[PDB]
């Protein structure tokens, strides 16, 4: 029981790398489902999806991340569990094969409470790396996902290698809380359990805290129209980005109340996505492209559909 | 002209060591009015203040900051311009006397333009140092909110982070919308608002408190808004429902034109105390205070809040 929606390559359309993203999206979804069926939690699932997404030599995450000004590699990643509302994130991490794994570890450790001080929800540089190792994590000698288990718990994660030639020590939206992803269950204030993951120009997603912002909007009755409004009002026309010459970014979203509504939206020419139900078998991949004539970073594309989980 | 409100951290009340805080708060405010009247950006006013704070060996920021799990100093700090809406942050930065300066610098370079490439607003550790260095920045929580005569606002925050924290651990002082916030009145927000936080970093980050306070202050009665936020969106916030005791403090200011500039400024905290300091332009006098939780009121369970009103121009 469960559902998964992932993304990769939310940027500019290439009549080439298309077939790859589809392939990595196909398995990323499956690994996730494998876990959901096998019984794992929303977080273990999403993590596995991102482990697969990062491992694709074609994604700018984990192995294959772009290189900073000094040719060195630095990864950003974060994850959030909707049931407990905990968050794990790493920034400018190097030497680890799966940065998301370190964020997930930080999250899990963080759920053990002060078992003997308040746990760290975000580490960076050498520190993140040392903590990772100090916890038995594979040391090497933008992609994201959303999930909902049989119980109804949503979760999300995101992983990226950052901008190319970015100055050393530059952290983007995949490490920043409320920006890269957001996972939050139902509550006396939230009618729906929502999960979000972002991609694109990290600076545009941060200045606007898009993830959190999408989750709050998606509390409205019309999911499709809530997201649309967010991508336009709070993103494309956001006062906080008025000094920009184009607003680039994309997001995937999941909303379960067990009814599951899933959507994706971008202001980039394209974004590849894949999804699959656990009571569905065989994944589904799609390349989302902006309407003809619509200018990249000036308009919005958005699609999605419902999916009942029995 | 202009106004200023600062703080030297929210936490335990230290009698005797209490006079050291009120003292640095004063010098901090002054440096602000000074640079302010000199006709400098609201950005320089807050930095000017933060530096003064960062230099007091009694404040967990800059010089005298808590040592990490390895006996070393790693600082976080950020700054936000309410006019341009830019932001500058550094996290886990060692080797620089004034982190806020690097935060400020990063902001400016941003305002300038596009290297093509979008400027970087958030840098951590190693590169954060190298950068601060290639920008002539002297090598070796506190907050401040300001409003210039034109009605613009700016917020800054600087912290040494949790004591004995595991290396590379970043807190609120470095995270957008968490440690500080600044936003001029706009088509939507009627009020120019500025916020700076302090306290248990994890608690402030998960509640994105700084930005939350700016949204809340958009309601009619600021005092009521600020209080309900500290209670319902902080102490009783669903995201901290597991934390037994929420510790944090915030100082904020709200302006608007009526020709005068009506300014409401407050300070609130769930910690035992918080030393703040406010002073107006032609005020010529700096007032300090050590906010304290109501006698017999549990810390991390209760909320203390105060605030006055200032009129400029
Ligand atoms: Cl990618
Ligand atoms: Cl602090």
Swiss-Prot record, chain B:
Keywords: Autocatalytic cleavage, Disease variant, Hydrolase, Protease, Threonine protease, Zymogen. One of its GO terms (cellular component) is cytosol. It comes from the Eukaryota. Transmembrane segments: none annotated. The keyword NADP does not apply. InterPro entries: Ntn_hydrolases_N, Peptidase_T2, Taspase1. The active site is at 141 (nucleophile). It holds the Pfam family Asparaginase_2. Gene3D superfamilies: (Glycosyl)asparaginase. One of its GO terms (molecular function) is threonine-type endopeptidase activity. Its EC number is 3.4.25.-. GO terms for biological process: positive regulation of DNA-templated transcription; protein maturation; proteolysis. The keyword Nucleotide-binding does not apply. Belongs to the Ntn-hydrolase family. Protease responsible for KMT2A/MLL1 processing and activation. It also activates KMT2D/MLL2. Through substrate activation, it controls the expression of HOXA genes, and the expression of key cell cycle regulators including CCNA1, CCNB1, CCNE1 and CDKN2A. It is linked to Suleiman-El-Hattab syndrome: An autosomal recessive syndrome characterized by global developmental delay with poor expressive language, poor fine motor skills and hypotonia, microcephaly, feeding difficulties with failure to thrive, recurrent respiratory infections, cardiovascular malformations, cryptorchidism, happy demeanor, and facial dysmorphism. Intramolecular proteolysis generates 2 subunits, alpha and beta, which reassemble through a non-covalent association to form the fully active enzyme. This is Threonine aspartase 1. It comes from Homo sapiens.
């Amino acid at each position: 029981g469960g559902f998964v929606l992932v993304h990769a390559g939310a940027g500019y359309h290439s009549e080439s790398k298309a077939k790859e993203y589809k392939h990595v999206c196909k398995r990323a979804c499956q690994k996730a489902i494998e876990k959901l069926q096998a019984g794992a939690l929303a977080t273990d699932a999403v993590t596995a999806a991102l482990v697969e997404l990062e491992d694709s030599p074609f994604t700018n995450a984990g192995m294959g991340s772009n290189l900073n000004l000094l040719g060195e590699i630095e990864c950003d990643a974060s994850i959030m569990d909707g049931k407990s509302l905990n968050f794990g994130a790493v920034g400018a991490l190097s030497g680890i094969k799966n940065p998301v794994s370190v964020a997930n570890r930080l999250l899990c450790e963080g759920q053990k409470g002060k078992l003997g001080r308040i746990p760290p929800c975000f580490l960076v540089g050498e520190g993140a790396y040392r903590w990772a190792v100090d916890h038995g994590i594979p040391s090497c000698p933008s992609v994201g996902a959303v999930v909902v288990d049989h119980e109804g718990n949503v979760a999300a994660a995101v992983s990226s290698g950052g901008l190319a030639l970015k100055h050393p020590g530059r952290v983007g939206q995949a490490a920043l809380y409320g920006c890269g992803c957001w996972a939050e269950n139902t509550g006396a204030h939230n009618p729906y359990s929502t999960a979000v993951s972002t991609s694109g120009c990290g600076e545009h997603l941060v200045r606007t805290i898009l993830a959190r912002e999408c989750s709050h909007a998606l509390q409205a009755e019309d999911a499709h129209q809530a997201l649309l409004e967010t991508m336009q009002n709070k993103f494309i026309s956001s006062p906080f980005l008025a000094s920009e010459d184009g607003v680039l970014g994309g997001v995937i979203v999941l909303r379960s109340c067990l009814l599951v509504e899933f959507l994706w939206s971008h202001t980039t020419e394209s974004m590849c996505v894949g999804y699959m139900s656990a009571q569905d078998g065989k994944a589904k991949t799609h390349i989302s492209r902006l309407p003809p004539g619509a200018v990249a970073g000036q308009s919005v594309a958005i699609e999605g559909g419902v999916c009942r989980l029995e």
